[PDB]
């Protein structure tokens, strides 16, 4: 067959030459039969599989014509080649038989290509794997022919200019076709591009390349992320799952039933069916992921072998040059292909995890709607929504880590094999270190978790103290108490800081072990290797290929414990879920919803029970209600009327009889149920909107006054924001919803409980009365009132679960049997915050085991960074940076030394075999490893102490400044916001931020060390890191910008699923009664899909990132390999080893660095907010220059001078120049219009509001010229609303401990708390809960006045809140104030006139100005505004 080209084809010796080109005939035979063979062996299948497809869908577009035209051009070239071959046949006497076989072949093939590119018009995926891969393969195989011909043409050998030139042009067209087939075509109608993108643009996730730009320009919104395709929609996956489940569930139910009946002749449930059902429904994706993972696990072990070949080549100086370029190119190609396989495996695996979580949440919801009440009472609503919110997450985590449990053992076994095959049985020393460091990592992780839990408890205590400080800041300002509470929260914070330091030290040990495992394993392996034998030499190939294999081995061997832990947690999660879904549905045998019947409601001989073991709550019942027949059942409390209602709907288990119901029911429960949303949405309750009926039912049910009181009217949002409607509004809203629903039977069940009498009668008359809106509808009332009965249609009295009698009210008042007796007698008739946070703690402490591999599974202005770094210190971060740079320099030195230890095998100069030399080598290698370890410990421990100092200082400043901010700041800012800055931002600064910054430093220095090694070998590489740096910088910028918003959107969308599930499982009787299950199913599926698209877009963002980063690391490896092949005449094999076994470890560090840059951007906003509250404006100085004469109020003489005060510097004066005077000892009341300036007086004597004009002078000293605390301590107050600080009676009465126990007891006896306080066990140290739960209201203000009396100043400003307190309390207050504060100036602010005439003086204050002065005796003679207001 050699004659086919008149020249030899399989020579194999032309390669054995410096400039070694392939033989032409070999090329034109096999490098042409490979692509054409691929095209022909599969094309009939592609055509046979496409021409049985959907509509022609032959939209004639621009790529389709471009590709057809280029293939036509190229067919024309093939025909021209045939013509020239025949023309040469007319010339020479002999022609190779292939000179026409090759062109003819192309002719046929291109027709086929023209018939495949047209075929694509029928499919949705235009450019598929087949034709795209054929173009790749053809362009790849033709480069050999290209290079041969061009090299021969520069020789000007005159062989054939025409053949060579037509080949050049045909190859150009094949390049343009490959490019034009990579491009995803002109996308059709607005589908997600995941299913219209070409093969290459879908392998590299380059169809996501426009979401990333779009998210970088302006932030993404829920309408900027494309919908997930229809195969993942909740309805689709749940339908598939239920088809695959029903059979397994039934089989397990049969097994459980047979087991129970065998036992009998709750700890058993139909079990071991969920995991089989999930595999039987997702097995195709399981296989796809399995095969992709297998291919990647086999491809991982080619790069060490190519590295071995390249070291060997650079060593042997008599080798060819075409070998080594081939090895560098193969390193690039293998890393590219394994990147594609791995990223596609992640996409499959993570989307399968998402689909498993989706189908499980949807199954949970579908089951909660039909769970038997007997099985529904076992759980709690918090625990059920927990079953949705943690169990499905655990099952998703197991689904992600499911393929690692065998992939990691394949990788471990192959790595042990390939390490053995190089370094003999002394590999087990290194692998033994690697394995033996697993229990140590576990021990450190356990101690970390214990410290974290104790810290969490201590943090919650501090947070509760802070919350009671902030919510009662007014009193704390009054009595000058911020130093005491400052010290208390400082003590708790000091405890938390010590725990944080211990956490830090263990984290440091964990980091040191993580970063020193590789150097220690290599020193142990090489020492044990070179020692155990004399003829056991260590050369560059063994040393550096074994180092590469150790870096491959150490990742699976460390992730294996966490994978097994995740599987074992998901096992118990599966048991919990599988127990929920197996519980039998509620039975509807007893209650039948027929369509036609004689009576609307018919109870036939029925008894019903909550729990069959006990006696029936409702006994035998025989009754019938015809349409329109209003019935008002009445009975003793606990008789079962509420139970009768509950049984009618179906919320009871039948013990006997049955019930017939026709039409649609409407339920008004005793327990009110209001969904999250607006009053209008609740009233409509998912029904058609009609303004006539809507306004009629608002008017009838008397909501209009409530809407007028409420801010938004019928648009106010209930729940999740907080309106907490009083029982009247809730009950009216429920009744309005029922009335608007327009049902057939209305089961009114005590709908006038929390309602006033007259409004209740109005509601009865215009809602359920005979003239009400519900005249024609059967309406069963459940009454605790009587006055409605004289006009109700019919009465059924109930007792002991049985009807005593039924009749009209006339019969009730006439028959005088049980009728009159009943008529006479009836007159006298949180859970998630501590658990949902636990799963976040677990998945953040388990995915924080990055180990430079944070691709395992994942979950701003420079001034802010400068603020944090200024807090942590500047010398500290200088020495942290320096002592990690020393670590990296020692690592570079260690590699350089190993390169000079493997080198003494080549230069076997006699002296490189003595035992002293080997001892020196292994000793200095160990010393370099030890120096690296010491530098790392110093750096990390210093980092921990410095970052602890930063956290301490930041919290100190924030708390010292918040406690000293004028009351306007606390009025204009929600307490929730400040507490949230003290809770989740001090925590971020404490825990997450230091480790994120430290890890960023470690990644940066690892990269810099690798790059300086590469550039130390071949310095030209310092120029190929200016474009690589630009590519990497652009990648991280785009990825972090987009991923931040995707994570935010996912978090925003996740919560509504659980909120809606909790609202469904809470108000289930109402949903079932209105017959609204399908609407709620649809809503839950909609919310799940809206979340699903965000989480899927996040997954794809991660894959986009990973492809780009593996490309950057691949280009580093490939460029260094090329520069070490090119420059081989000046370097050695050892340099190749240590340059190229490190560049292989540059993609993991790049992934880690991008992830940590994103994390630092996310976390530093905590410092942003903390620094925002550090700078909040402060009050006046507490102590400025002056002191009192040991007692500033001598007798309480207060003088005003046209005082003018403003609430906020941009507003109008509330006081407009008051000029009055109070002498020593008089009692002054102040009066006026509502909002005329009452509050400002008691708010301005304490300087809480600074003067805008005028001044107040006490005892000849102006208020504005003394320190704020100095003045504020010397007065006295009884605040408007008594706030009690949780703790001890001693602290509440006296936190400063300045008052002795004897006088505290004397003041408490003056306040007369001996009966209540002395009777307590501890006495004056009795615990005080958060205000209430003890110390009755009267005790509360009596304690407040005790505080006032032990303060015992000469000035008593006070005001009254409400008269709800017992009159004895007010009388005691006034008597005490008059008996022990008689000789003290008193100012009272009262809006109740009846307690003011007793005052020695009254000030009249309207519109912020005085009206009259003098005593009430001096007033009442006149008839001024005081008279116009008093006694009326």
Short mmCIF file of N, CA, C and O in Angstrom, two decimals, residues 28-119:
data_model
loop_
_atom_site.label_atom_id
_atom_site.label_comp_id
_atom_site.label_asym_id
_atom_site.label_seq_id
_atom_site.Cartn_x
_atom_site.Cartn_y
_atom_site.Cartn_z
N UNK A 28 -1.86 12.13 4.44
CA UNK A 28 -2.99 12.09 3.52
C UNK A 28 -3.79 10.82 3.63
O UNK A 28 -4.91 10.76 3.12
N UNK A 29 -3.26 9.78 4.27
CA UNK A 29 -4.07 8.58 4.50
C UNK A 29 -4.82 8.67 5.83
O UNK A 29 -6.04 8.79 5.84
N UNK A 30 -4.10 8.71 6.95
CA UNK A 30 -4.78 8.54 8.23
C UNK A 30 -5.26 9.87 8.81
O UNK A 30 -6.34 9.93 9.41
N UNK A 31 -4.50 10.96 8.66
CA UNK A 31 -4.95 12.23 9.21
C UNK A 31 -6.10 12.77 8.39
O UNK A 31 -6.73 13.76 8.76
N UNK A 32 -6.38 12.14 7.25
CA UNK A 32 -7.60 12.41 6.50
C UNK A 32 -8.68 11.38 6.73
O UNK A 32 -9.88 11.71 6.67
N UNK A 33 -8.35 10.13 7.04
CA UNK A 33 -9.38 9.15 7.36
C UNK A 33 -9.90 9.25 8.79
O UNK A 33 -10.92 8.63 9.11
N UNK A 34 -9.23 10.00 9.67
CA UNK A 34 -9.73 10.15 11.03
C UNK A 34 -10.94 11.08 11.05
O UNK A 34 -12.02 10.66 11.48
N UNK A 35 -10.84 12.34 10.60
CA UNK A 35 -12.04 13.19 10.60
C UNK A 35 -13.14 12.66 9.70
O UNK A 35 -14.31 12.64 10.11
N UNK A 36 -12.81 12.23 8.48
CA UNK A 36 -13.82 11.72 7.58
C UNK A 36 -14.45 10.45 8.13
O UNK A 36 -15.66 10.24 7.99
N UNK A 37 -13.65 9.60 8.76
CA UNK A 37 -14.20 8.42 9.41
C UNK A 37 -15.16 8.77 10.52
O UNK A 37 -16.23 8.17 10.64
N UNK A 38 -14.80 9.76 11.34
CA UNK A 38 -15.72 10.21 12.39
C UNK A 38 -17.02 10.72 11.79
O UNK A 38 -18.10 10.42 12.29
N UNK A 39 -16.92 11.47 10.70
CA UNK A 39 -18.11 12.02 10.07
C UNK A 39 -19.01 10.92 9.52
O UNK A 39 -20.23 10.98 9.66
N UNK A 40 -18.42 9.90 8.91
CA UNK A 40 -19.23 8.91 8.20
C UNK A 40 -19.78 7.83 9.12
O UNK A 40 -20.91 7.37 8.92
N UNK A 41 -19.01 7.38 10.11
CA UNK A 41 -19.50 6.33 10.99
C UNK A 41 -20.70 6.76 11.84
O UNK A 41 -21.43 5.89 12.32
N UNK A 42 -20.91 8.06 12.03
CA UNK A 42 -21.99 8.54 12.88
C UNK A 42 -23.07 9.31 12.14
O UNK A 42 -24.18 9.44 12.67
N UNK A 43 -22.79 9.83 10.95
CA UNK A 43 -23.77 10.65 10.24
C UNK A 43 -25.08 9.94 9.96
O UNK A 43 -26.14 10.57 10.11
N UNK A 44 -25.11 8.68 9.50
CA UNK A 44 -26.41 8.03 9.30
C UNK A 44 -27.24 8.00 10.55
O UNK A 44 -28.46 8.17 10.47
N UNK A 45 -26.63 7.80 11.72
CA UNK A 45 -27.39 7.87 12.96
C UNK A 45 -27.94 9.26 13.23
O UNK A 45 -29.09 9.40 13.67
N UNK A 46 -27.16 10.31 12.98
CA UNK A 46 -27.67 11.65 13.23
C UNK A 46 -28.84 11.96 12.32
O UNK A 46 -29.88 12.47 12.77
N UNK A 47 -28.72 11.64 11.03
CA UNK A 47 -29.83 11.88 10.11
C UNK A 47 -31.03 11.01 10.46
O UNK A 47 -32.18 11.46 10.40
N UNK A 48 -30.78 9.75 10.84
CA UNK A 48 -31.83 8.81 11.20
C UNK A 48 -32.53 9.22 12.49
O UNK A 48 -33.65 8.77 12.75
N UNK A 49 -31.88 10.05 13.30
CA UNK A 49 -32.45 10.49 14.56
C UNK A 49 -33.06 11.88 14.49
O UNK A 49 -33.85 12.24 15.37
N UNK A 50 -32.71 12.68 13.49
CA UNK A 50 -33.27 14.02 13.36
C UNK A 50 -34.50 14.05 12.47
O UNK A 50 -35.47 14.73 12.77
N UNK A 51 -34.50 13.30 11.37
CA UNK A 51 -35.63 13.36 10.45
C UNK A 51 -36.85 12.61 10.97
O UNK A 51 -37.79 12.37 10.20
N UNK A 52 -36.87 12.25 12.25
CA UNK A 52 -38.09 11.85 12.95
C UNK A 52 -38.44 12.87 14.03
O UNK A 52 -38.77 12.51 15.16
N UNK A 53 -38.37 14.15 13.68
CA UNK A 53 -38.54 15.20 14.67
C UNK A 53 -39.76 16.06 14.38
O UNK A 53 -40.56 15.75 13.49
N UNK A 54 -39.88 17.16 15.12
CA UNK A 54 -41.08 17.99 15.17
C UNK A 54 -41.22 18.81 13.90
O UNK A 54 -40.64 18.48 12.86
N UNK A 55 -42.02 19.87 13.98
CA UNK A 55 -42.28 20.74 12.84
C UNK A 55 -40.99 21.14 12.13
O UNK A 55 -39.91 21.16 12.73
N UNK A 56 -41.13 21.44 10.84
CA UNK A 56 -39.97 21.69 9.99
C UNK A 56 -39.07 22.77 10.58
O UNK A 56 -37.84 22.67 10.51
N UNK A 57 -39.67 23.82 11.15
CA UNK A 57 -38.94 24.83 11.92
C UNK A 57 -37.75 25.38 11.13
O UNK A 57 -36.69 25.68 11.68
N UNK A 58 -37.95 25.55 9.82
CA UNK A 58 -36.87 25.86 8.90
C UNK A 58 -36.74 27.35 8.64
O UNK A 58 -36.57 27.78 7.50
N UNK A 59 -36.86 28.17 9.69
CA UNK A 59 -36.55 29.58 9.59
C UNK A 59 -35.19 29.79 8.95
O UNK A 59 -34.16 29.40 9.51
N UNK A 60 -35.18 30.41 7.78
CA UNK A 60 -33.96 30.63 7.02
C UNK A 60 -33.24 31.84 7.60
O UNK A 60 -33.71 32.97 7.46
N UNK A 61 -32.11 31.62 8.25
CA UNK A 61 -31.40 32.66 8.96
C UNK A 61 -30.02 32.90 8.35
O UNK A 61 -29.68 32.37 7.30
N UNK A 62 -29.20 33.72 9.02
CA UNK A 62 -27.93 34.14 8.45
C UNK A 62 -26.78 33.16 8.69
O UNK A 62 -26.03 32.89 7.75
N UNK A 63 -26.58 32.64 9.90
CA UNK A 63 -25.59 31.57 10.04
C UNK A 63 -25.88 30.40 9.12
O UNK A 63 -24.96 29.78 8.60
N UNK A 64 -27.15 30.03 8.97
CA UNK A 64 -27.40 28.85 8.17
C UNK A 64 -26.92 29.06 6.74
O UNK A 64 -26.23 28.20 6.18
N UNK A 65 -27.19 30.23 6.16
CA UNK A 65 -26.68 30.50 4.82
C UNK A 65 -25.17 30.65 4.81
O UNK A 65 -24.52 30.21 3.87
N UNK A 66 -24.59 31.28 5.83
CA UNK A 66 -23.14 31.44 5.84
C UNK A 66 -22.44 30.09 5.86
O UNK A 66 -21.51 29.85 5.08
N UNK A 67 -22.90 29.18 6.72
CA UNK A 67 -22.29 27.87 6.80
C UNK A 67 -22.52 27.08 5.51
O UNK A 67 -21.60 26.42 5.02
N UNK A 68 -23.72 27.14 4.94
CA UNK A 68 -23.94 26.43 3.69
C UNK A 68 -23.06 26.98 2.58
O UNK A 68 -22.49 26.22 1.79
N UNK A 69 -22.93 28.30 2.50
CA UNK A 69 -22.12 28.90 1.44
C UNK A 69 -20.66 28.51 1.59
O UNK A 69 -19.99 28.22 0.60
N UNK A 70 -20.14 28.50 2.82
CA UNK A 70 -18.74 28.12 2.98
C UNK A 70 -18.51 26.65 2.66
O UNK A 70 -17.52 26.31 2.01
N UNK A 71 -19.43 25.77 3.06
CA UNK A 71 -19.26 24.37 2.68
C UNK A 71 -19.35 24.21 1.17
O UNK A 71 -18.65 23.38 0.58
N UNK A 72 -20.20 25.01 0.51
CA UNK A 72 -20.28 24.94 -0.95
C UNK A 72 -18.97 25.41 -1.59
O UNK A 72 -18.47 24.79 -2.53
N UNK A 73 -18.41 26.51 -1.10
CA UNK A 73 -17.11 26.98 -1.57
C UNK A 73 -16.09 25.87 -1.47
O UNK A 73 -15.28 25.64 -2.38
N UNK A 74 -16.11 25.16 -0.35
CA UNK A 74 -15.08 24.18 -0.07
C UNK A 74 -15.27 22.92 -0.91
O UNK A 74 -14.29 22.31 -1.35
N UNK A 75 -16.52 22.56 -1.20
CA UNK A 75 -16.80 21.53 -2.20
C UNK A 75 -16.29 21.93 -3.57
O UNK A 75 -15.77 21.10 -4.33
N UNK A 76 -16.46 23.20 -3.94
CA UNK A 76 -15.94 23.70 -5.21
C UNK A 76 -14.42 23.53 -5.26
O UNK A 76 -13.86 23.12 -6.28
N UNK A 77 -13.74 23.84 -4.16
CA UNK A 77 -12.30 23.62 -4.10
C UNK A 77 -11.95 22.15 -4.28
O UNK A 77 -10.96 21.82 -4.95
N UNK A 78 -12.72 21.25 -3.68
CA UNK A 78 -12.44 19.83 -3.85
C UNK A 78 -12.59 19.41 -5.30
O UNK A 78 -11.78 18.63 -5.83
N UNK A 79 -13.62 19.91 -5.98
CA UNK A 79 -13.79 19.60 -7.39
C UNK A 79 -12.64 20.14 -8.23
O UNK A 79 -12.15 19.47 -9.15
N UNK A 80 -12.18 21.36 -7.92
CA UNK A 80 -11.02 21.91 -8.61
C UNK A 80 -9.80 21.02 -8.39
O UNK A 80 -9.00 20.81 -9.31
N UNK A 81 -9.63 20.50 -7.18
CA UNK A 81 -8.52 19.59 -6.90
C UNK A 81 -8.60 18.34 -7.76
O UNK A 81 -7.59 17.89 -8.31
N UNK A 82 -9.80 17.78 -7.90
CA UNK A 82 -9.97 16.62 -8.78
C UNK A 82 -9.60 16.97 -10.22
O UNK A 82 -8.94 16.18 -10.92
N UNK A 83 -10.02 18.14 -10.69
CA UNK A 83 -9.71 18.54 -12.07
C UNK A 83 -8.21 18.69 -12.28
O UNK A 83 -7.67 18.25 -13.30
N UNK A 84 -7.51 19.32 -11.33
CA UNK A 84 -6.06 19.46 -11.46
C UNK A 84 -5.36 18.10 -11.39
O UNK A 84 -4.37 17.88 -12.09
N UNK A 85 -5.86 17.19 -10.56
CA UNK A 85 -5.28 15.85 -10.51
C UNK A 85 -5.40 15.16 -11.87
O UNK A 85 -4.44 14.57 -12.36
N UNK A 86 -6.58 15.25 -12.49
CA UNK A 86 -6.74 14.66 -13.82
C UNK A 86 -5.88 15.36 -14.87
O UNK A 86 -5.35 14.71 -15.78
N UNK A 87 -5.74 16.69 -14.78
CA UNK A 87 -4.86 17.39 -15.71
C UNK A 87 -3.43 16.89 -15.58
O UNK A 87 -2.74 16.71 -16.59
N UNK A 88 -2.97 16.66 -14.35
CA UNK A 88 -1.67 16.03 -14.17
C UNK A 88 -1.65 14.61 -14.71
O UNK A 88 -0.61 14.12 -15.16
N UNK A 89 -2.80 13.92 -14.66
CA UNK A 89 -2.90 12.60 -15.29
C UNK A 89 -2.65 12.68 -16.79
O UNK A 89 -2.10 11.75 -17.38
N UNK A 90 -3.07 13.78 -17.41
CA UNK A 90 -2.75 14.03 -18.81
C UNK A 90 -1.28 14.37 -19.03
O UNK A 90 -0.85 14.48 -20.19
N UNK A 91 -0.51 14.53 -17.96
CA UNK A 91 0.90 14.86 -18.06
C UNK A 91 1.80 13.66 -17.87
O UNK A 91 2.04 12.90 -18.81
N UNK A 92 2.32 13.49 -16.65
CA UNK A 92 3.20 12.37 -16.35
C UNK A 92 2.53 11.04 -16.65
O UNK A 92 1.30 10.95 -16.75
N UNK A 93 3.34 9.99 -16.79
CA UNK A 93 2.83 8.68 -17.14
C UNK A 93 2.28 7.91 -15.94
O UNK A 93 1.57 6.92 -16.13
N UNK A 94 2.60 8.34 -14.72
CA UNK A 94 2.13 7.67 -13.52
C UNK A 94 1.59 8.70 -12.54
O UNK A 94 2.13 9.80 -12.39
N UNK A 95 0.50 8.33 -11.87
CA UNK A 95 -0.12 9.18 -10.85
C UNK A 95 -0.47 8.30 -9.65
O UNK A 95 -0.92 7.16 -9.82
N UNK A 96 -0.24 8.77 -8.43
CA UNK A 96 -0.65 8.01 -7.25
C UNK A 96 -2.14 7.75 -7.26
O UNK A 96 -2.93 8.63 -7.61
N UNK A 97 -2.57 6.54 -6.88
CA UNK A 97 -4.01 6.23 -6.89
C UNK A 97 -4.82 7.05 -5.91
O UNK A 97 -6.05 7.10 -6.05
N UNK A 98 -4.19 7.67 -4.91
CA UNK A 98 -4.93 8.51 -3.97
C UNK A 98 -5.06 9.95 -4.45
O UNK A 98 -5.89 10.69 -3.91
N UNK A 99 -4.29 10.35 -5.46
CA UNK A 99 -4.35 11.73 -5.94
C UNK A 99 -5.74 12.10 -6.42
O UNK A 99 -6.07 13.29 -6.47
N UNK A 100 -6.56 11.12 -6.78
CA UNK A 100 -7.97 11.35 -7.04
C UNK A 100 -8.89 10.76 -5.98
O UNK A 100 -10.06 11.14 -5.92
N UNK A 101 -8.39 9.86 -5.13
CA UNK A 101 -9.23 9.30 -4.08
C UNK A 101 -9.50 10.32 -2.98
O UNK A 101 -10.63 10.42 -2.49
N UNK A 102 -8.49 11.08 -2.58
CA UNK A 102 -8.71 12.12 -1.58
C UNK A 102 -9.71 13.16 -2.04
O UNK A 102 -10.68 13.41 -1.31
N UNK A 103 -9.58 13.79 -3.22
CA UNK A 103 -10.61 14.76 -3.62
C UNK A 103 -11.98 14.15 -3.72
O UNK A 103 -12.93 14.67 -3.12
N UNK A 104 -12.11 13.00 -4.40
CA UNK A 104 -13.42 12.38 -4.55
C UNK A 104 -14.07 12.21 -3.19
O UNK A 104 -15.23 12.59 -2.98
N UNK A 105 -13.31 11.70 -2.22
CA UNK A 105 -13.84 11.52 -0.88
C UNK A 105 -14.45 12.81 -0.35
O UNK A 105 -15.63 12.84 0.00
N UNK A 106 -13.67 13.90 -0.37
CA UNK A 106 -14.23 15.17 0.09
C UNK A 106 -15.54 15.50 -0.59
O UNK A 106 -16.51 15.85 0.09
N UNK A 107 -15.60 15.35 -1.92
CA UNK A 107 -16.86 15.61 -2.60
C UNK A 107 -18.00 14.94 -1.84
O UNK A 107 -18.84 15.62 -1.25
N UNK A 108 -17.95 13.61 -1.73
CA UNK A 108 -19.03 12.92 -1.06
C UNK A 108 -19.25 13.50 0.33
O UNK A 108 -20.36 13.94 0.66
N UNK A 109 -18.18 13.62 1.11
CA UNK A 109 -18.33 14.08 2.49
C UNK A 109 -19.02 15.42 2.54
O UNK A 109 -19.93 15.63 3.35
N UNK A 110 -18.63 16.36 1.67
CA UNK A 110 -19.20 17.68 1.81
C UNK A 110 -20.68 17.69 1.45
O UNK A 110 -21.46 18.37 2.12
N UNK A 111 -21.10 16.87 0.48
CA UNK A 111 -22.53 16.71 0.29
C UNK A 111 -23.18 16.31 1.60
O UNK A 111 -24.14 16.93 2.05
N UNK A 112 -22.60 15.31 2.27
CA UNK A 112 -23.15 14.89 3.55
C UNK A 112 -23.16 16.03 4.55
O UNK A 112 -24.14 16.21 5.28
N UNK A 113 -22.09 16.83 4.59
CA UNK A 113 -22.10 17.97 5.51
C UNK A 113 -23.19 18.94 5.11
O UNK A 113 -23.93 19.45 5.96
N UNK A 114 -23.34 19.19 3.80
CA UNK A 114 -24.43 20.05 3.36
C UNK A 114 -25.78 19.47 3.72
O UNK A 114 -26.76 20.20 3.83
N UNK A 115 -25.85 18.15 3.91
CA UNK A 115 -27.10 17.52 4.31
C UNK A 115 -27.21 17.34 5.81
O UNK A 115 -28.24 16.84 6.28
N UNK A 116 -26.17 17.69 6.57
CA UNK A 116 -26.29 17.69 8.02
C UNK A 116 -26.54 19.10 8.54
O UNK A 116 -27.39 19.29 9.41
N UNK A 117 -25.84 20.09 8.00
CA UNK A 117 -26.09 21.46 8.42
C UNK A 117 -27.52 21.88 8.13
O UNK A 117 -28.07 22.73 8.84
N UNK A 118 -28.13 21.33 7.09
CA UNK A 118 -29.54 21.59 6.85
C UNK A 118 -30.40 20.87 7.87
O UNK A 118 -31.39 21.42 8.36
N UNK A 119 -30.03 19.64 8.22
CA UNK A 119 -30.77 18.87 9.21
C UNK A 119 -30.91 19.61 10.52
O UNK A 119 -31.95 19.51 11.19
#
